[PDB]
Every structure is written in C-alpha cells, then in structure tokens.
Design a protein around this ligand. Structure first.
Ligand SMILES: [Fe+3]
Ligand SMILES: [Fe+3]
Lengths: 126, 127
C-alpha cells in the first residue's frame, strides 16, 4: 500500500507557519529538521514547512485536515477566541461561518503566508 | 484524538497527465475526476488533488515523497526502468541513474510531467 509520507509547503517564515498550525490544531511543537519545520500528522504523513527563497510572492496551496468532533470544538474555539478570520467555503465567499457538509462540520482559515487551510470532521462525500 | 492530513492540492500543467503518470507508475487505480481535480488516493487516508495551473508563469516545483514496501519498490522501480523515466538517487538530482540506500532501505527520485520532485522510499527517514 503506497503512502504519502511527506510534502513540502513553502512559506515566508517556516517557524511562524509551523507554530501557528501546531498551536491552532492542538499538536506538539514542530520539530526542526535541517531547513524544515516539521508538522507531523497522525496518518503517517508530515508537512515540511520551508522558507521561500524565490523573489515573488507565495503561491497559495491547500491543506485539509480530518479531525474528531471534540477536536473541532477545541480548534474552532481557538479560531474564535484568537479572532482568526475564517470561512465556510474554499473560495472564501461565506466569511465567519462553518459548513455542515457530509453530516459533519468544517471551516477554512489561512496560515500567516496565506495558504488555504481547512478542517473537517467527516470524509468528503460521506 | 487524531489530526490527519486528508488532502492537498498539487498544481500542474495538465492534471490528467500528471495524475495518470503517477497512478500508472505507483501501480494505483486510474485517478478519480472530482470537479477541477484529478484525485490520486494514497493508502494512509490522504489524497493528492492534481489541479490545472491557471497562472501565467511556470510551475513552482514541489516535493511529494511516498513510503512503499520492498515488493512495491521492485514493481515501481521496474516501471521506472522499463519506461525510461529519468531518475536520481538524491533530491538535488546530481546522481542520475542511481538509487539510494538511505536508512538501510532503497529510495529514488523522479519527476512528473510538470517537474515536481517525486520520491519513493522503502524505510522511514531516520530509520
Ligand atoms: Fe478541501
Ligand atoms: Fe524527501
């Protein structure tokens, strides 16, 4: 069975983005590994945050996280208490709302570099 | 309690070309069409969503690394060899036509049609 083991996400500040995501998602502090700040997820995959060295701006990507119901209450609680801008939809046309797709709950937010981050409590499509 | 990475987007020139190349090479079923995405489902409850790049410049190459079994490596590397797919032992592509022996396992790097840095490995990094 072929697993996705790690992927790189380019950001303006790897420590700022990795720590923001770890704190918000309720995960341990990211590990420093060479030029990477490592965010380890539960399903044997890690995001390697790396400082962008190019000249222009960050090309925003998309990472979506599947979490438990209790974790949604905790993470969305930190979104609300921290005044973090959030949206119910990927295109950010529904600000300040959460979605109820697939019988679960979901919400979108951004890391400091503007990547489109998402949490969800049920797999897409049921 | 578990935060999982469920999916991530990879921008490419041709989502069907890249997703099919990866599925064929990795021995996976044909990618699934979902809206503007060609979906490559991996075993550990995570999918790569290939999406056509709409910008003006060239693709910013990313990095995706896949952990596979020893038997799967023989099959996948067999397709790399038989297909004449350019490959390297190292992330910087200075060792062409070689595989690495990192962590007592085997690993090799290659590219999708849009030039993303793809990697397969039989043992987790660091052991
Ligand atoms: Fe999504
Ligand atoms: Fe790697």
């Amino acid at each position: 069975a072929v697993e996705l083991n790690h992927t790189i996400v380019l950001v303006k500040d790897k420590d700022a983005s990795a720590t923001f995501m770890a704190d918000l998602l309720g995960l341990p502090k990211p590990k420093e590994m060479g030029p990477f700040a490592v965010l380890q997820l539960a399903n044997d995959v890690s995001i390697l945050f790396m400082d962008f060295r190019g000249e222009g701006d960050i090309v925003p990507g998309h990472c979506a996280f599947l979490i438990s119901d209790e974790e949604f209450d905790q993470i969305f609680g930190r979104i609300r208490e921290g005044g973090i801008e959030h949206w119910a939809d990927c295109y950010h046309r529904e600000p300040g709302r959460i979605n109820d797709r697939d019988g679960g709950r979901g919400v979108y937010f951004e890391d400091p570099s503007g990547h489109n981050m998402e949490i969800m409590t049920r797999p897409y499509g049921s």
